[PDB]
Nucleic acid binder design. Structure first.
Ligand SMILES: [Mg+2]
Ligand SMILES: [Mg+2]
Ligand SMILES: [Mg+2]
Ligand SMILES: [Mg+2]
Ligand SMILES: [Mg+2]
Ligand SMILES: [Mg+2]
Ligand SMILES: [Mg+2]
Ligand SMILES: [Mg+2]
Ligand SMILES: [Mg+2]
Ligand SMILES: [Mg+2]
Ligand SMILES: [Mg+2]
Ligand SMILES: [Mg+2]
Ligand SMILES: [Mg+2]
Ligand SMILES: [Mg+2]
Ligand SMILES: [Mg+2]
Ligand SMILES: [Mg+2]
Ligand SMILES: [Mg+2]
Ligand SMILES: [Mg+2]
Ligand SMILES: [Mg+2]
Ligand SMILES: [Mg+2]
Ligand SMILES: [Mg+2]
Ligand SMILES: [Mg+2]
Ligand SMILES: [Mg+2]
Ligand SMILES: [Mg+2]
Ligand SMILES: [Mg+2]
Ligand SMILES: [Mg+2]
Ligand SMILES: [Mg+2]
Ligand SMILES: [Mg+2]
Ligand SMILES: [Mg+2]
Ligand SMILES: [Mg+2]
Ligand SMILES: [Mg+2]
Ligand SMILES: [Mg+2]
Ligand SMILES: [Mg+2]
Ligand SMILES: [Mg+2]
Ligand SMILES: [Mg+2]
Ligand SMILES: [Mg+2]
Ligand SMILES: [Mg+2]
Ligand SMILES: [Mg+2]
Ligand SMILES: [Mg+2]
Ligand SMILES: [Mg+2]
Ligand SMILES: [Mg+2]
Ligand SMILES: [Mg+2]
Ligand SMILES: [Mg+2]
Ligand SMILES: [Mg+2]
Ligand SMILES: [Mg+2]
Ligand SMILES: [Mg+2]
Ligand SMILES: [Mg+2]
Ligand SMILES: [Mg+2]
Ligand SMILES: [Mg+2]
Ligand SMILES: [Mg+2]
Ligand SMILES: [Mg+2]
Ligand SMILES: [Mg+2]
Ligand SMILES: [Mg+2]
Ligand SMILES: [Mg+2]
Ligand SMILES: [Mg+2]
Ligand SMILES: [Mg+2]
Ligand SMILES: [Mg+2]
Ligand SMILES: [Mg+2]
Ligand SMILES: [Mg+2]
Ligand SMILES: [Mg+2]
Ligand SMILES: [Mg+2]
Ligand SMILES: [Mg+2]
Ligand SMILES: [Mg+2]
Ligand SMILES: [Mg+2]
Ligand SMILES: [Mg+2]
Ligand SMILES: [Mg+2]
Ligand SMILES: [Mg+2]
Ligand SMILES: [Mg+2]
Ligand SMILES: [Mg+2]
Ligand SMILES: [Mg+2]
Ligand SMILES: [Mg+2]
Ligand SMILES: [Mg+2]
Ligand SMILES: [Mg+2]
Ligand SMILES: [Mg+2]
Ligand SMILES: [Mg+2]
Ligand SMILES: [Mg+2]
Ligand SMILES: [Mg+2]
Ligand SMILES: [Mg+2]
Ligand SMILES: [Mg+2]
Ligand SMILES: [Mg+2]
Ligand SMILES: [Mg+2]
Ligand SMILES: [Mg+2]
Ligand SMILES: [Mg+2]
Ligand SMILES: [Mg+2]
Ligand SMILES: [Mg+2]
Ligand SMILES: [Mg+2]
Ligand SMILES: [Mg+2]
Ligand SMILES: [Mg+2]
Ligand SMILES: [Mg+2]
Lengths: 208, 141, 57, 38, 174
RNA sequence: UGCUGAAAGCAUCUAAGCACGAAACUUGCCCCGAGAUGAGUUCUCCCUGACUCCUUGAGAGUCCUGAAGGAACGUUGAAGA
RNA sequence: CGAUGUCGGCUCAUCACAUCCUGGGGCUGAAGUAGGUCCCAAGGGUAUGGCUGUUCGCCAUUUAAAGUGGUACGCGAGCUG
RNA sequence: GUGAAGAGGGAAACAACCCAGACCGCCAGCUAAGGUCCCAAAGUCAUGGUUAAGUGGGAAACGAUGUGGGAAGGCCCAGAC
């Protein structure tokens, strides 16, 4: 199905033979089920979960009630997962990191680090024009953006400067190294999106 | 001496049902567009939507002559750099069977605010059930 | 506009515009589109009699 | 096969067939004589 | 025209039924069903079957003469049951049956386990020969054609899966 | 490329019918996505006092209440012109 | 002609298919390897250098390939000159 | 001949092509070219055929048991193709 978890930086695990494997430490606290959606009401089968612990004055009544229907404590934020026919869950149930004890590889979704207004060189890997040899005010500029009379227009999806990052991106099939049940961790190989403290949706690899 | 024009507020609009099972697409679509526009009515005014609400059910079973089941293509552009999509009459019914009647009628309606207003009148359905039992929509042929 | 109205009101009584007008011309009826269209909207019970009058021819 | 615009019966065993709108020439003896179109 | 004007004989123990245009022929080997074309019209006349072209339709004789020749094969199928004799030519080429799955080894890196749709009885007298039996000419001919298509005759040594009656043209090296 | 099979006693991949068949096509993978005006769905939350005027409207008010929530302001950020 | 900046390079591209590679097929004077030609196929990919203002071309060394074209012989209110 | 110096209707849009020459007004009727299932005024008109290719709705040499008409010419009861 999937679990929500805060990113907690990066480390490495040294395997006894020698290999140091760079790991992302994802803390995965008790993901508790706030709602179960089904074909009768909603037209599709899913579960809504929560995690963390939001202070009571910061949570609003419309959500405070929403948690009181389940009976769970008010976690910081809500996420939904689609069920794969066979599995079935109940409201108020706490899903733990022990689901990933069986799996080998995981898709990790997160929000990428925001680079702000990025130019074409940074954003699209556009090539810098000649740094000298006569060049006039046009070193890192994008160059041409179209043809002439014929279109007489720039085409849609033309790679230009603009907002880079702060976008939801998914890194697929990362190898799970260790699944610590006691501290509630999930060590995956490689790097996943977003900064330390960002929320990650970790789930089993679709590309088996 | 100022000839009659239909005043929207006074327009008494009627509800109808059409079973499109085994009907010819275009010959259905025409008779639909004639009604939706309100041509059949004797108080027809071209600038007012005098036509009737129609419920076309069993849209997926609509018939087409010759080899148009495979050969008829529904092109459209995505508004993108080179994004011309196409779909044959089979492929269209496989995915979106409502679109077939929709597109055929929309081509035969006028083009503009009122033409779009008189398309809203049309209610297409893939299945045989319709949830507009509340209007007592009478049977049409 | 009138012709459309007449063609509409005629087909309610089971005759097309083309045949109706020939029917009226062959019965030497001199009434114009402007009025046939006025009658079509207002007095249908009257209008019907013109369609019968046309049906004779 | 050949896709020429003027297919014809080259040998005796060659045979003309219309498959899916296209005129073809199928042969038992020489597969060289196999040819379509036209 | 000429095929259509030649009644099909129906031997005893062959239950024929005409559900409008949908024909059902049952016998000893197997029950067979055929949804026939609308342009054809078919009837029982005495012992034999009769196939007539419908009035109004353009191509009647062509459609009827087909129905005739189908039901002719359909009656022979349920009575006798058709067979096809395939043989595997070339060294290291093996054919072995286990249930309803033919295990072909045709010089590949993986043994090819061909499935048998419908009532098709597959046998092997020798290890390099497949004799398969059944009711439908259609399914038999297809299965045979698949079993062939895994390794067609190489026109040099004649290597591959072949029909028994099939002649193969080989040529010399140049 | 085939199977059965006429028209055309045969023959033939097809005219009924029936299978395979490619980085193309439609999905599958990732992202945006109800301004999708056809503006969808589920869950939760909150407001359950009166008088006046009328050319009786989905009408203009007088008074008492101001909720859920939001914005504003501040401290700010791996968010950001 | 009361001005539509003309070659080549850079940047940025985009479409066509008459396909250079990669994918699927027929014939072959197709043993295999490797081809030859033809058919379908436009998803993606498709050198770096020496000389010359060059486009092209020749040459050296690579590459699975180093495609042919359209786009004001694409692109100077984007650069060069 | 038309435009130039001529509006109006038709040919999708289209000075010169087809129809036709605007003195002014009318919420009258008959016709031209061209049309009559819907966009859009009028035939889902009548009868008898053709077309299966979406031909109609771009094109040649040449290719072909496509398919309709005809007018002829090779054989039968000694029973040919
Ligand atoms: Mg930032
Ligand atoms: Mg920068
Ligand atoms: Mg980078
Ligand atoms: Mg550079
Ligand atoms: Mg540079
Ligand atoms: Mg300078
Ligand atoms: Mg400058
Ligand atoms: Mg300068
Ligand atoms: Mg500078
Ligand atoms: Mg500048
Ligand atoms: Mg400047
Ligand atoms: Mg992997
Ligand atoms: Mg084909
Ligand atoms: Mg074609
Ligand atoms: Mg045969
Ligand atoms: Mg055969
Ligand atoms: Mg398939
Ligand atoms: Mg690949
Ligand atoms: Mg979203
Ligand atoms: Mg609504
Ligand atoms: Mg809602
Ligand atoms: Mg709801
Ligand atoms: Mg109250
Ligand atoms: Mg009020
Ligand atoms: Mg007050
Ligand atoms: Mg207030
Ligand atoms: Mg207050
Ligand atoms: Mg508040
Ligand atoms: Mg908010
Ligand atoms: Mg502010
Ligand atoms: Mg602030
Ligand atoms: Mg600050
Ligand atoms: Mg700041
Ligand atoms: Mg000038
Ligand atoms: Mg000027
Ligand atoms: Mg210049
Ligand atoms: Mg030059
Ligand atoms: Mg260069
Ligand atoms: Mg580039
Ligand atoms: Mg090609
Ligand atoms: Mg060529
Ligand atoms: Mg080619
Ligand atoms: Mg090639
Ligand atoms: Mg490869
Ligand atoms: Mg391969
Ligand atoms: Mg091949
Ligand atoms: Mg082609
Ligand atoms: Mg390409
Ligand atoms: Mg394309
Ligand atoms: Mg492309
Ligand atoms: Mg694809
Ligand atoms: Mg790419
Ligand atoms: Mg040097
Ligand atoms: Mg150089
Ligand atoms: Mg070289
Ligand atoms: Mg190489
Ligand atoms: Mg080129
Ligand atoms: Mg050009
Ligand atoms: Mg040029
Ligand atoms: Mg060019
Ligand atoms: Mg240029
Ligand atoms: Mg260029
Ligand atoms: Mg420019
Ligand atoms: Mg230039
Ligand atoms: Mg400049
Ligand atoms: Mg100079
Ligand atoms: Mg200089
Ligand atoms: Mg002059
Ligand atoms: Mg004129
Ligand atoms: Mg004109
Ligand atoms: Mg024209
Ligand atoms: Mg027109
Ligand atoms: Mg027009
Ligand atoms: Mg016009
Ligand atoms: Mg011209
Ligand atoms: Mg004329
Ligand atoms: Mg005159
Ligand atoms: Mg005059
Ligand atoms: Mg006058
Ligand atoms: Mg007239
Ligand atoms: Mg007259
Ligand atoms: Mg006409
Ligand atoms: Mg218009
Ligand atoms: Mg018009
Ligand atoms: Mg009309
Ligand atoms: Mg008719
Ligand atoms: Mg055409
Ligand atoms: Mg010819
Ligand atoms: Mg004769």
């Amino acid at each position: 199905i999937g679990l929500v978890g805060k990113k907690v930086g990066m480390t490495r695990i040294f395997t006894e033979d020698g290999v140091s494997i760079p790991v992302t430490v994802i803390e995965v606290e008790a993901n508790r089920v706030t709602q179960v959606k089904d074909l009768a009401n909603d037209g599709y089968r899913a579960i809504q979960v929560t995690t963390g612990a939001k202070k009571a004055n910061r949570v609003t009544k419309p959500e405070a009630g929403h948690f009181a229907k389940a009976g769970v404590e008010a976690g910081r934020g809500l996420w939904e997962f689609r069920l794969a026919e066979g599995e079935e869950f109940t409201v108020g149930q706490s899903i733990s990191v022990e689901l990933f004890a069986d799996v080998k590889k995981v898709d990790v979704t997160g929000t990428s680090k925001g680079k702000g207004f990025a130019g074409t060189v940074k954003r699209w890997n556009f090539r810098t024009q000649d740094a000298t040899h006569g060049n006039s005010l046009s070193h890192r500029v994008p160059g041409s953006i179209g043809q002439n009379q014929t279109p007489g227009k720039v085409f849609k999806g033309k790679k230009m400067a603009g907002q880079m990052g702060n976008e939801r991106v998914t890194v697929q099939s990362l190898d799970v190294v260790r699944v610590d049940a006691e501290r509630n961790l999930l060590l995956v190989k490689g790097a996943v999106p977003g900064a330390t403290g960002s929320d990650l949706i970790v789930k089993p690899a679709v590309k088996a | 001496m100022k000839t009659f024009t239909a005043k929207p507020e006074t327009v008494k609009r009627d509800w109808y049902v059409v079973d499109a099972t085994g009907k010819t697409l275009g010959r259905l679509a025409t008779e639909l567009a004639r009604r939706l526009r309100g041509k059949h009515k004797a108080e027809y005014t071209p600038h007012v939507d005098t036509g009737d609400y129609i419920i076309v059910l069993n849209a997926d079973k609509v018939a087409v002559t010759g080899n148009k089941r495979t050969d008829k293509v529904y092109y459209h552009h995505t508004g993108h750099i080179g994004g011309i999509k196409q779909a044959t009459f089979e492929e269209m019914i496989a995915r979106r069977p409502e679109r077939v009647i929709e597109i055929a009628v929309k081509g035969m309606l006028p083009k503009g605010p009122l033409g779009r207003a008189m398309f809203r009148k049309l209610k297409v359905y893939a299945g045989n059930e319709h949830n507009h039992a509340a209007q007592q929509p009478q049977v049409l042929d | 506009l009138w012709i459309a109205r007449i063609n509409a009101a005629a087909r309610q009584n089971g005759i097309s515009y083309s045949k109706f007008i020939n029917g009226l011309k062959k019965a030497s009826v001199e009434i114009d589109r402007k009025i046939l269209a006025d009658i079509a909207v207002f007095d249908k019970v009257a209008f019907t009699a013109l369609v019968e009058k046309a049906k004779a021819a | 096969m050949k896709v020429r615009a003027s297919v014809k019966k080259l040998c005796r065993n060659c045979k003309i067939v219309k498959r899916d709108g296209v005129i073809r020439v199928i042969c038992s003896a020489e597969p060289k004589h196999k040819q379509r179109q036209g | 025209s000429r095929v259509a004007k030649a009644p099909v004989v129906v031997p005893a123990g062959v239950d024929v039924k005409i559900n409008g245009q949908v024909i059902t022929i049952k016998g000893k080997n197997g029950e067979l069903t055929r949804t026939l074309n609308d342009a054809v019209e078919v009837k029982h006349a005495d012992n034999t079957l009769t196939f007539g072209p419908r009035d109004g339709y353009a191509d009647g004789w062509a459609q009827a003469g087909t129905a005739r020749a189908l039901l002719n094969s359909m009656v022979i199928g349920v009575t006798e049951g058709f067979t096809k004799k395939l043989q595997l030519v070339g060294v290291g080429y093996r054919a072995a049956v286990k249930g309803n799955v033919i295990n072909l080894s045709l010089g590949f890196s993986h043994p090819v386990d061909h499935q048998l749709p419908a009532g098709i009885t597959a046998e092997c007298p020798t290890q390099t020969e497949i004799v398969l039996k059944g009711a439908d000419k259609q399914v038999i001919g297809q299965v045979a054609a698949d079993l062939r298509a895994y390794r067609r005759p190489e026109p040099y040594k004649g290597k591959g899966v072949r029909y028994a009656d099939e002649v193969v043209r080989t040529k010399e090296a140049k």
